[PDB]
Every structure is written in structure tokens, then in C-alpha cells.
Design a protein around this ligand. Structure first.
Ligand code: CAG
Ligand code: CAG
Ligand code: MG
Ligand code: MG
Lengths: 166, 166
């Protein structure tokens, strides 16, 4: 069948594992799983279309220098995730973009912006801010929460749609 | 606040009222409401952003000749809806596109493609077909059902996102 190599990218502790765990095994990872390279692949029906979502949850901290180069060349879609209480995670959602452009030899590659953790009162990255970066980037902006599942499907499915025009 | 004039467009009996009724008043309209010009407007939080969704559900049958011209000039986003069991509704999702381009003096205007009624066994418009029209159009493709609510939010929210880059 059709199938999709989505890489889930972003900083440490922003949520990208709780995102994926939400998508597949249907629960919140309050508890612990301090991980690096993780691969799940699912038989999924997106808009009447049968497809394999093959998703590479990645490691935050840069124990990961040129190893980012590998999978990034083998990623069709990229979910660039950050958190709304960690302004710094936002600031770094640019050098991820820049390294992807590097390895891809391309300046527009399927990508979605995800300001995660939105069920929190501890807001620091306003939407308005985040949104105009998506704008600067030409990539969508979808806010999310792995606590509430809120946003999680919109998030992954949008990216797929991005790949479809590419 | 920010606010969004979404027009919901498409053929007769494809579902565009059951779509909207699903979005707002939270139920399926099995029963009856054979309608023309209908306006609902909602205070909605889309991705941390407060906005007024002002949505014009429209009439199917062309009792509607130049009256389409009016609201179409006052529509930011357009949901172009059809049904998966009515190949003809598909075929006509082009002359809606063409009249919008007409009145807009524009060839790319925020728009989403919605092949509705997907909870049905009576399929006639395959995804593959529909999808490559979205492609031909550069507009997304989202399948939906007002029976199951399935797709309904993805549908409207995507379009908003389309308007945001425009
Ligand atoms: C960097 C390292 O792990 P990492 O893999 O580099 O970074 P992750 O994004 O994978 O971290 P993970 O998503 O597993 O943890 C997210 C943290 O926020 C919480 N969580 C996740 N997303 C949300 C959200 O949407 N809302 C709410 N309310 N809670 C959420 C989790 O309980 C967890 O403490 C890591 C760092 C810090 C904490 C965890 C952690 N980890 O490996 O689990
Ligand atoms: C043209 C005229 O009305 P119209 O306003 O021109 O066209 P509408 O799209 O508004 O028609 P509406 O959406 O109200 O009705 C949809 C029909 O399919 C059913 N329905 C809607 N969408 C779905 C879907 O996702 N799945 C399923 N299983 N059922 C759905 C409804 O019960 C209804 O019979 C009209 C024509 C035929 C029938 C109704 C009708 N109408 O005014 O209600
Ligand atoms: Mg992880
Ligand atoms: Mg109607």
C-alpha cells in the first residue's frame, strides 16, 4: 500500500513521545520512557486511503550529532514539535528546520509545526508568535496536547496531506 | 477578535447542512430542514486563537443564479462539499470552483475539498479519484461524515488554516 515515513522531530521534553504514544497505544505517558530511536508503523485509513504510517519518534538531547543526518534523509513528513511553556524549545524550532533543509538540499519539504502541551496554564509561547513563524515558514500551525489527545490526530494527518502534494 | 467568513458550498443533498448542524448544535439531522440562506456564527478557540466562525450554509439547487455572486465575494474560506455516492456531485465540484475564481478575479483562493458521507457502503467516488482533483486544484482533500462527526472538525479547521496563509 501507500506508506509514509513521518519523522517526529523537536527538543527534549517537549512532548514528542507522549504525542506518538497517544496516537498508537491510546494513553498518556505520565510515567517514564527516556528514549532514543523508536519506530512504530500502523495500518491507518486516512480519507478512504489505506496507508502505512511508519513513524520515527526521535531523541531530544543532541546525543545525536550526525545521526540526525541519516533518518532525516529518509523522512517524508516531519512533525516539528515544541511546548508552550518552554520558549527556548520554540527558539530552537529553526535550527531543526535549517538542518533538514541542509540534508534535503531543499527549502520547502513537508512539515508541520506543533506547539504542544496546550492544556497547561503555564503559557509562554503565545499562539500569535508561533503562528507567524509557521507563516514565515509556509508550514501549517497546529496546537496539541498528549494529555487530552486534543489536536493529536489533526497533527499527524495534516502532515500526511502535506506529503500528498509532494 | 479575528473572524472568519467561511461559505459552505456544493450540490444538493450532498450533506452541507448536516455538516454545519454537526459542527454547532451537536446532532445528526436525519430529519428535515430543506433550506436556503443560513447563517451561524461561533466563538471558537482554534489553536490558542480566539475567533468568530461566521459560516454561511447555502442552498443546493440553483434557485440561486446570481445570488451565488453576492456571498461568494464575501467569503474568506470555502468548503466545497460533495458525497461519495453521487459521482455527479463530484463532476459539478469544478463549476463551483470556476464561478468562485470568476467573482474573485483570483485562481487560488482558500478552499477545502470535502467528500462527505463516507460512513456509507454505497461508494461511487473513490478517494484516489477525488484526491488527484484536490491535487489538480492545489486544495487539500478531507473526507467526512455528519453521521459519525468523523472528519467534521478537521474539515472546518483546515480551511481556517488555509485562510491564515492568505
Ligand atoms: C528529554 C526527555 O525525553 P525526549 O524523548 O528527549 O523528549 P520527549 O518529548 O520524548 O519527552 P516525553 O514526550 O516522553 O515527555 C514529555 C513530558 O511532558 C509530559 N507530557 C508530554 N506532552 C504533554 C502534553 O501535551 N501535556 C501535558 N500536560 N503533559 C505532557 C510528560 O509527562 C513528560 O514529562 C524528557 C525530559 C523531561 C521529561 C521527560 C522526558 N522523557 O524522556 O519522558
Ligand atoms: C438538496 C436538499 O437540501 P440542500 O440544502 O440543497 O442540500 P444539503 O446538503 O443541505 O442536504 P442536507 O445536508 O440537509 O441533507 C443531507 C442528506 O443526507 C443525509 N446526511 C447528510 N450528510 C450525511 C453523511 O455524512 N452521512 C449520512 N449517512 N447521512 C448524511 C441527511 O439525512 C439528508 O438526507 C436535500 C436533498 C435531499 C435530501 C435532503 C435535503 N435536505 O434539504 O435535507
Ligand atoms: Mg522520546
Ligand atoms: Mg441547506
Amino acid at each position: 500500500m501507500t506508506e509514509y515515513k513521518l519523522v517526529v522531530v523537536g527538543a527534549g521534553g517537549v512532548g514528542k513521545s507522549a504525542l506518538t504514544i497517544q496516537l498508537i497505544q491510546n494513553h498518556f505517558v505520565d510515567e517514564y520512557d527516556p528514549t532514543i530511536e523508536d519506530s512504530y508503523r500502523k495500518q491507518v485509513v486516512i480519507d478512504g486511503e489505506t496507508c502505512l504510517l511508519d513513524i520515527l519518534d526521535t531523541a531530544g538531547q543532541e546525543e545525536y550529532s550526525a545521526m540526525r543526518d541519516q533518518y532525516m534523509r529518509t523522512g517524508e513528513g516531519f512533525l516539528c514539535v515544541f511546548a508552550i511553556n518552554n520558549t527556548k524549545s520554540f527558539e530552537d524550532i529553526h535550527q531543526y528546520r535549517e538542518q533538514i533543509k541542509r540534508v534535503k538540499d531543499s527549502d520547502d519539504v513537508p512539515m508541520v509545526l506543533v506547539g504542544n502541551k496546550c492544556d497547561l496554564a503555564a503559557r509562554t509561547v503565545e499562539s500569535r508568535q508561533a503562528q507567524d513563524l509557521a507563516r514565515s515558514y509556509g508550514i501549517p500551525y497546529i496546537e496539541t496536547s498528549a494529555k487530552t489527545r486534543q489536536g493529536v490526530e489533526d497533527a499527524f494527518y495534516t502532515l500526511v496531506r502535506e506529503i500528498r502534494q509532494h
